[PDB]
Amino acid sequence: QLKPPVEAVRSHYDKSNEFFKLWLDPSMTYSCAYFERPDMTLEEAQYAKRKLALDKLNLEPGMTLLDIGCGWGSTMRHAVAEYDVNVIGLTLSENQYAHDKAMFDEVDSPRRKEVRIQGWEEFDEPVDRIVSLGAFEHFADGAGDAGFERYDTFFKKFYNLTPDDGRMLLHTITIPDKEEAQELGLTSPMSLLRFIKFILTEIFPGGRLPRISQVDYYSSNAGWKVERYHRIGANYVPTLNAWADALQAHKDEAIALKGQETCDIYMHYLRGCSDLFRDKYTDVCQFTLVK
Ligand SMILES: Nc1ncnc2c1ncn2[C@@H]1O[C@H](CSCC[C@H](N)C(=O)O)[C@@H](O)[C@H]1O
Numbered sequence: 359q360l361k362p363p364v365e366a367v368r369s370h371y372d373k374s375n376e377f378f379k380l381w382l383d384p385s386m387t388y389s390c391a392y393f394e395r396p397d398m399t400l401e402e403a404q405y406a407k408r409k410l411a412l413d414k415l416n417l418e419p420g421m422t423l424l425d426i427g428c429g430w431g432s433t434m435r436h437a438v439a440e441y442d443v444n445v446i447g448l449t450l451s452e453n454q455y456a457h458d459k460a461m462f463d464e465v466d467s468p469r470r471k472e473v474r475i476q477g478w479e480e481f482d483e484p485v486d487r488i489v490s491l492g493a494f495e496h497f498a499d500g501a502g503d504a505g506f507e508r509y510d511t512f513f514k515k516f517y518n519l520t521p522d523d524g525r526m527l528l529h530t531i532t533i534p535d536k537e538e539a540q541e542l543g544l545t546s547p548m549s550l551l552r553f554i555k556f557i558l559t560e561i562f563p564g565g566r567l568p569r570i571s572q573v574d575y576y577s578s579n580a581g582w583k584v585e586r587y588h589r590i591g592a593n594y595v596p597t598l599n600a601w602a603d604a605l606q607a608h609k610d611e612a613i614a615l616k617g618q619e620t621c622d623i624y625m626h627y628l629r630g631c632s633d634l635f636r637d638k639y640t641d642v643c644q645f646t647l648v649k
């Protein structure tokens with residue numbers, strides 16, 4: 359069986375909740391926002407992004423929703439409150455677990471609000487609908503068993519854990535297909551290579567970005583059909599800019615918590631990544647997978 363990338367994932371996400379709070383929106387949503395309307399704030403765009411994803415699962419009350427890689431819980435909390443479903447959240451982060459365990463305790467509701475420190479590789483329960491936002495980029499990584507081949511186990515596992523009317527909303531960052539890349543005229547300056555190196559070393563160790571053709575191959579191989587490809591990477595520019603700005607704003611506060619270095623590293627990372635999505639080097643897509 360497969361082994362979850364615990365140390366690699368925790369090296370980032372367990373940096374400090376207080377820290378992440380300083381620059382993330384109030385719901386601490388940590389994935390590409392969605393500005394469905396020009397005048398939304400980051401916080402409203404995040405809600406819009408969550409809604410966009412959830413409305414595609416055609417959720418009815420009573421169903422059990424599975425959030426693979428639930429971060430700081432926003433999607434779970436939103437799912438219950440707006441669709442009245444039961445939710446199980448998976449994460450490898452200890453601080454996110456701690457944070458969500460407490461966040462759920464605040465408001466009481468009939469439905470189930472479960473958060474676990476369990477990898478998708480170990481999940482084995484029947485669920486109605488699945489949602490994963492910004493966690494997929496870690497799925498080709500593992501504690502010793504890294505490799506894209508992992509996607510195959512992924513789409514099969516969850517194809518078998520869902521009903522005939524099963525649906526999965528896969529939200530992930532993506533890189534251009536061999537062709538679509540040359541048409542964009544994407545170059546790789548020495549500075550770009552240095553940045554990627556910086557990201558894979560200090561920010562997201564083990565991260566791997568899929569091409570759309572990869573998601574198609576492995577998901578279809580399990581029997582899934584993409585009912586809709588919704589590319590929205592351009593939205594990541596406002597998002598990453600909002601995050602970097604918010605961090606600049608509370609710079610003194612942040613330098614207090616984590617020091618000077620950590621803050622320089624993060625600003626560099628937030629700023630650098632924005633241009634990647636603006637320049638079309640990377641994109642974001644929400645695959646609506648159905649049977
Ligand atoms: N193998 C694995 N199994 C389960 N969760 C994983 C994982 N690798 C990474 N993750 C989780 O995926 C998340 C990436 S951050 C995304 C958080 C959330 N979906 C949001 O949109 O705010 C983290 O919570 C991390 O713990």
Ligand SMILES: CCCCCCCCCC[N+](C)(C)CCCCCCCCCC
Nearest residue numbers: 388389492493495554562565566631640
């Ligand atoms: C090229 C190496 C890429 C490693 C990517 C690891 C991605 C982890 C994504 C995690 N979330 C969803 C929390 C988002 C973080 C902000 C966007 C970062 C985009 C980086 C693009 C690098 C090319």
